[PDB]
Design a protein around this ligand. Structure first.
Ligand SMILES: [K+]
Ligand SMILES: [K+]
Ligand SMILES: [K+]
Ligand SMILES: [K+]
Ligand SMILES: [K+]
Ligand SMILES: [K+]
Ligand SMILES: [K+]
Ligand SMILES: [K+]
Ligand SMILES: [Mg+2]
Ligand SMILES: [Mg+2]
Ligand SMILES: [Mg+2]
Ligand SMILES: [Mg+2]
Ligand SMILES: [Mg+2]
Ligand SMILES: [Mg+2]
Ligand SMILES: [Mg+2]
Ligand SMILES: [Mg+2]
Ligand SMILES: [Mg+2]
Ligand SMILES: [Mg+2]
Ligand SMILES: [Mg+2]
Ligand SMILES: [Mg+2]
Ligand SMILES: [Mg+2]
Ligand SMILES: [Mg+2]
Ligand SMILES: [Mg+2]
Ligand SMILES: [Mg+2]
Ligand SMILES: [Mg+2]
Ligand SMILES: [Mg+2]
Ligand SMILES: [Mg+2]
Ligand SMILES: [Mg+2]
Ligand SMILES: [Mg+2]
Ligand SMILES: [Mg+2]
Ligand SMILES: [Mg+2]
Ligand SMILES: [Mg+2]
Ligand SMILES: [Mg+2]
Ligand SMILES: [Mg+2]
Ligand SMILES: [Mg+2]
Ligand SMILES: [Mg+2]
Ligand SMILES: [Mg+2]
Ligand SMILES: [Mg+2]
Ligand SMILES: [Mg+2]
Ligand SMILES: [Mg+2]
Ligand SMILES: [Mg+2]
Ligand SMILES: [Mg+2]
Ligand SMILES: [Mg+2]
Ligand SMILES: [Mg+2]
Ligand SMILES: [Mg+2]
Ligand SMILES: [Mg+2]
Ligand SMILES: [Mg+2]
Ligand SMILES: [Mg+2]
Ligand SMILES: [Mg+2]
Ligand SMILES: [Mg+2]
Ligand SMILES: [Mg+2]
Ligand SMILES: [Mg+2]
Ligand SMILES: [Mg+2]
Ligand SMILES: [Mg+2]
Ligand SMILES: [Mg+2]
Ligand SMILES: [Mg+2]
Ligand SMILES: [Mg+2]
Ligand SMILES: [Mg+2]
Ligand SMILES: [Mg+2]
Ligand SMILES: [Mg+2]
Ligand SMILES: [Mg+2]
Ligand SMILES: [Mg+2]
Ligand SMILES: [Mg+2]
Ligand SMILES: [Mg+2]
Ligand SMILES: [Mg+2]
Ligand SMILES: [Mg+2]
Ligand SMILES: [Mg+2]
Lengths: 160, 33, 128, 224
RNA sequence: AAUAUUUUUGU
RNA sequence: CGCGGCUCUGAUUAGUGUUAAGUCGAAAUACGGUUCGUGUAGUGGAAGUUGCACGGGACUUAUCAAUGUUGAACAAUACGA
RNA sequence: AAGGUCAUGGCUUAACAAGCCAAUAAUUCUCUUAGUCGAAGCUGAAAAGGCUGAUCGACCACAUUGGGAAUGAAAAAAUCCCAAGGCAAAUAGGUACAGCAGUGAGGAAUCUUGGUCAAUGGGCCCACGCCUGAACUGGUAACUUGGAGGAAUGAGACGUCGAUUUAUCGAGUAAAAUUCUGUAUACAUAUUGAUAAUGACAAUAUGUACAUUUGUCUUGACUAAUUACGUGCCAGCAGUCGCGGCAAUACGUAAGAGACUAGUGUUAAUCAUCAUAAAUAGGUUUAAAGGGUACUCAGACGGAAAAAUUCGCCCAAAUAUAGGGGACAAUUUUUCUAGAGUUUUAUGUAAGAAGGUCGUACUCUAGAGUGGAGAGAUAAAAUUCUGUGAUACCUAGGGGACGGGUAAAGGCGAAGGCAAUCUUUUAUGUAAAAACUGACGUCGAAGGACGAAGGCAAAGGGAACAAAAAGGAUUAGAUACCCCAGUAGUCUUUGCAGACAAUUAUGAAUGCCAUAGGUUAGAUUUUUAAUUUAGUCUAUAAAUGAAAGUGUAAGCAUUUCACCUCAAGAGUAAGGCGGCAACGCAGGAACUGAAAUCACUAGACCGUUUCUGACACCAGCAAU
RNA sequence: AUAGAUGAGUUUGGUGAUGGCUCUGAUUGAACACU
């Protein structure tokens, strides 16, 4: 549920704050959705699921994970490659919005306003470098992707 | 709460505890216990 | 506070603050008329020193307030109908009102040349 | 926060901006520092980024929530188990001094362990037995014990000749008029004398000192 | 090592 | 007409606020000169003080009788502050 | 089952059944207050913004107060009937200005006892026409808004005024004077408001004519703007901080200066300021504020991979018919094992309870013990003990409660709390592997249970300690601190009671973040010594914080409960609830304020530690 | 509706916080004083 995305937002911050090369996340359908959005946005390096130990860094991309059946699903995990440039992390902040206590849904007319630095609803305008991820019917897109696809949905988190 | 301020509450609760004793019999005559 | 605690009514108004002139603030009136009950003198508190001219007044509503007499020299006494306005003597406890000097019975300072509007003094009409 | 903000990695980015424009608006920027162009194309390396360290041993596969994923692991070789077995069976082999100070690092270039225990550059010690054992055990397909016996007996035949040379070399020199200095046995005894004498001085001094304590226990100041 | 008299006030 | 509620008032009586210039002590802040506070139960003109358990917002404020070493001779073309 | 209805519905009726709604207030009751609403008015950058509920529109109610019916298509009346009081009236049987104007009263405060039905609307009428205090128009008020309210020239009247440097600094292009305009307004003319006709009253256009007031606040800082004299904590000023005690930029005068202007200030009020009740969007270690505890009903929140249903969510509105998209969401179904649980006697362990005991010391009795004058107390003493033989040293019988070492930064329970010992008895928790159930989970208002010491009630016990009461000292006084003695009480059993610095000054829980040095109970191993699980404790990194500091959290996030909204009054009053009582729970307002409050920094002080100087002291001599 | 988000004085020996109060802005079916 949304509780998993919240834990993922905090952990990715703590990992970047600790300047760690690799980071692990529980293998779930929801976490893989946001992870692909961060990777497609350019914040993380790669995503590969594996066991409790990280894959061989030399062959990260070439890593051939084994099938995920009920005999090992309890041990799988998503291994994310963090990014650091110019003595500063690329995923500094991952402030969430939709928490378990309240789910915030935004409309297309509002995302069009938030995409240009103007508040709308329980959100605030996006400034230089910021980024907003929205969970919609077409997957976990970015506010600028959802605005292009003309759809609204559930706001997940804001990335700086 | 500091100790200096706690002594302000200490004097208030004592003077009250001391007052309810003095007027205990008077409050018993009027059925105000 | 959690959203649930707010749903049950945890947000209550802040405790009210006392007004400088309750008799006027309570009924939303700018001024009231009262009969002077006593014209005496009040002493300021620790820092200030002197004899502040005050007047115990019984407003039309019924409240008995203590008003301050501004200016130098007054002509009011027992049973004087005077107009009371808001204000307060910052150094005199209980003196939470002022008296208009161009009021019904209270006269304005005749030897006032500056701020005559504050003391109800007509212009001297020297040339006129 | 006892630390300080160190910006040593951005000395170029900072110096490059301060030298782009002039403080006195309306004039061209003065020449930059002489070092700004030298390291123009030599950026710093990435620091403070914990990677997955090299695993010198198969990590525990049964662990579901493993810790210390960013901790350097211990370097263990197959020889470590052989060194412990040999030197434990030959404890006094450690008394034989061995130099661990390398000359040029090119010592493993002339080591061919198919010839024998005696190699070029390294002394005949418990390591040569280990390296010879590991070779036979791997190449010749011998067991740990079999290879150990073979490599261990070659070590003895070479050490025996070493002790026989010292005895004969001295005896041979005196048969032609060759005299030597003080052997180690004599020098060792002379040193014990100088130390034993110092202990005797300490014993007699303390012994006499204890007599005063024994007499001071009782009181005889009255001189009855 | 186990010792212990009293000693208020300051527009 | 009865009951209940509500407002005003009441001999007598209680608490508290304010007011530089009075009197009596010196409880706290230093080891405040009896460690101070919490609870509870007594007691004293007043602050206070006493028993019982509890807290540190007081003792981490801590700083050697292990008294501190001939740890392999000497001489050489070795060695040379 | 039947009737009724367009149709549906105990809507209606008959016979059976005992159900339906709610459990956290459905239902009912008391008190206080109010006409409701709208971008209608005001206000904010903004929030499902805030406030008001005038003028405008919609809705509700009322027409002196209270109690009522009929007529009619429809009560939708200032009607009608009845009662009471006020005015009037008497055998009468009217009136109630919250209809317009107006009068009195109240109040800080709000208008003409006009004209006309010409226009718009309405009622009556075949028609003409009659009636209209609605309405349209004139009047009063700076209450508000909008506009006018005068522009250009102006240097030698070689004058005047105030300062002072007689020439400096100003009044000052200011004035006078000259050249133009004809603004508000006045008057005339014309058109128009109206047309079938009707004009109460006025607007608009054009022509001609006239150049008409200053007032007020401020002047220490916030806050734009200065001196002089007088006054002397007096008189006074003040929105806040403050000013005034004899050379006051703050008071009162005079002059100058700053600003608004037919207005200007003041008082009152509202919004914003204020993230200052924070849904957006807060916070609770030391500053207001974590509940004593966690089992738990309701209630919020909570895995994996699929499917049905809703069509929630989105396109996406206008409160959108009917559809589309399927990530997420709600109910539900099938599987899964990472959460939470069960089994395999763990080890270890002062959780708890029952029945019993052990021992060191203390105390009591006896042995007409030994011994024969002191003992104990305190800084010193006194009260006190002892010749009726004490203290001291023994013997033999009892009697109560206590828990030495081990012992540690140790451990155990939800907390409170638990430390001699044996038997009996009881729930969690931790390690290692396997197996099993398959989201069964976390938090949790309320209720209930538990809850230290002290206390109340009843019966036991009573050695020791010790509130009270009492005495002896100290002291200026001494209830006190000290001392001689000493009752409740402490202990046992059965109840009440529920307050604590019930503390980690830090609620519980989940996910997550880099190291090191100790330590506790286990596990594994090449059991030497290193890995490792769950705890606890020091010192750090990133970070965080007001800082102190924390750093298995006071960090990054999340869930949920409790609690906080300046000080003081006050955790107080009143009513109520619980209790035998003591007291507990709950819980205001008036009066008075501009501050309360936290951490840190540097000093000073200490009947504070360790030092360093000095006839400071000791000693000696001399002197007063 | 895309220009709309602002501070100041005041606690302390002093610094940094916390937390009020007051001023700055707009307004009234307003009243009063001097005009
Ligand atoms: K301390
Ligand atoms: K759907
Ligand atoms: K005897
Ligand atoms: K435990
Ligand atoms: K005693
Ligand atoms: K109980
Ligand atoms: K540890
Ligand atoms: K009270
Ligand atoms: Mg507090
Ligand atoms: Mg004041
Ligand atoms: Mg003036
Ligand atoms: Mg003035
Ligand atoms: Mg003093
Ligand atoms: Mg009375
Ligand atoms: Mg004391
Ligand atoms: Mg004292
Ligand atoms: Mg003390
Ligand atoms: Mg105490
Ligand atoms: Mg006593
Ligand atoms: Mg202290
Ligand atoms: Mg009303
Ligand atoms: Mg009404
Ligand atoms: Mg009227
Ligand atoms: Mg009337
Ligand atoms: Mg009147
Ligand atoms: Mg008409
Ligand atoms: Mg008509
Ligand atoms: Mg007609
Ligand atoms: Mg004209
Ligand atoms: Mg007509
Ligand atoms: Mg200024
Ligand atoms: Mg001040
Ligand atoms: Mg002045
Ligand atoms: Mg005007
Ligand atoms: Mg607590
Ligand atoms: Mg409680
Ligand atoms: Mg409490
Ligand atoms: Mg659909
Ligand atoms: Mg299953
Ligand atoms: Mg299985
Ligand atoms: Mg499990
Ligand atoms: Mg056991
Ligand atoms: Mg005898
Ligand atoms: Mg016993
Ligand atoms: Mg405890
Ligand atoms: Mg013990
Ligand atoms: Mg629970
Ligand atoms: Mg409860
Ligand atoms: Mg008890
Ligand atoms: Mg008891
Ligand atoms: Mg009893
Ligand atoms: Mg006494
Ligand atoms: Mg007990
Ligand atoms: Mg306790
Ligand atoms: Mg709790
Ligand atoms: Mg412990
Ligand atoms: Mg620490
Ligand atoms: Mg924080
Ligand atoms: Mg309070
Ligand atoms: Mg309470
Ligand atoms: Mg009460
Ligand atoms: Mg200091
Ligand atoms: Mg001297
Ligand atoms: Mg002397
Ligand atoms: Mg003499
Ligand atoms: Mg201070
Ligand atoms: Mg603050």
């Amino acid at each position: 549920g949304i509780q998993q995305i919240t834990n993922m937002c905090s952990h990715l911050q703590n990992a970047s704050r600790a300047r760690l090369g690799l980071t692990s996340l529980p293998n779930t359908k929801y976490n893989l959705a946001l992870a692909l959005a961060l990777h497609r946005a350019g914040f993380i390096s790669s995503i590969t699921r594996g066991g409790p130990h990280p894959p061989t860094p030399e062959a990260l991309m070439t890593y051939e994970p084994e099938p995920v059946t009920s005999a090992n699903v309890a041990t799988r995990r998503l291994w994310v490659g963090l990014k650091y440039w110019n003595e500063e992390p690329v995923l500094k902040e991952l402030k969430p919005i939709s928490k378990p206590s309240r789910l915030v849904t935004a409309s297309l007319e509002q995302l069009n306003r938030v995409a240009r630095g103007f508040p709308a609803g329980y959100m605030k305008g996006l400034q230089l470098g910021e980024c907003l991820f929205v969970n919609t019917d077409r997957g976990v897109l970015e506010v600028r992707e959802a605005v292009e696809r003309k759809v609204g949905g559930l706001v997940l988190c804001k990335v700086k | 709460i500091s100790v200096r301020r706690q002594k302000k509450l200490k004097i208030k609760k004592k003077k009250y505890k001391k007052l309810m004793r003095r007027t205990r019999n008077e409050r018993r005559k009027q059925d105000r216990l | 506070a959690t959203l649930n605690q707010v749903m049950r009514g945890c947000r209550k108004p802040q405790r009210a603050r006392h007004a400088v002139s309750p008799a006027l603030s309570s009924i939303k009136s700018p001024a009231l008329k009262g009969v002077c009950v006593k014209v005496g003198i009040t002493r300021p508190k620790k820092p200030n020193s002197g004899e502040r001219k005050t007047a115990r007044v019984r407003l039309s509503t019924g409240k008995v307030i203590t008003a301050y007499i501004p200016g130098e020299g007054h002509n009011i006494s027992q049973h004087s109908v005077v107009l009371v306005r808001g204000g307060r003597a910052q150094d005199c406890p209980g003196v939470r009102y002022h008296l208009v000097r161009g009021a019904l019975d209270l006269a304005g300072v005749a030897t006032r040349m500056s701020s005559r509007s504050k003391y109800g003094t007509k212009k001297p009409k020297k040339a006129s | 926060g006892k630390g300080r903000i160190f910006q040593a990695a951005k000395v170029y980015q900072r110096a490059s901006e301060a030298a782009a424009t002039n403080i006195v608006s309306g004039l061209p920027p003065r020449n930059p520092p002489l070092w700004l162009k030298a390291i123009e194309s030599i950026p710093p390396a990435e620091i403070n980024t914990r990677p997955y360290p090299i695993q010198h041993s198969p990590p525990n596969p049964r662990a579901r929530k493993p810790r210390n994923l960013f901790r350097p692991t211990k370097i263990v070789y197959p020889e470590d188990e052989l060194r412990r077995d040999f030197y434990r069976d030959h404890p006094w082999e450690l008394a034989r001094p061995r130099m661990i100070i390398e000359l040029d690092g090119k010592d493993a270039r002339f080591l061919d362990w198919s010839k024998g225990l005696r190699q070029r550059g390294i002394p005949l010690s418990g390591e040569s037995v280990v390296q010879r054992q590991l070779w036979l055990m791997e190449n010749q397909g011998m067991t740990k014990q079999e290879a150990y016996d073979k490599a261990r007996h070659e070590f003895y035949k070479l050490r025996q000749l070493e002790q026989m040379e010292r005895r004969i070399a001295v005896e041979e020199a005196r048969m032609v008029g060759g005299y030597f200095g003080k052997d180690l046995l004599t020098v060792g005894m002379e040193l014990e004398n100088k130390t034993y004498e110092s202990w005797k001085k300490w014993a007699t001094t303390e012994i006499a000192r204890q007599e005063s304590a024994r007499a001071s226990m009782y009181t005889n100041v009255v001189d009855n």
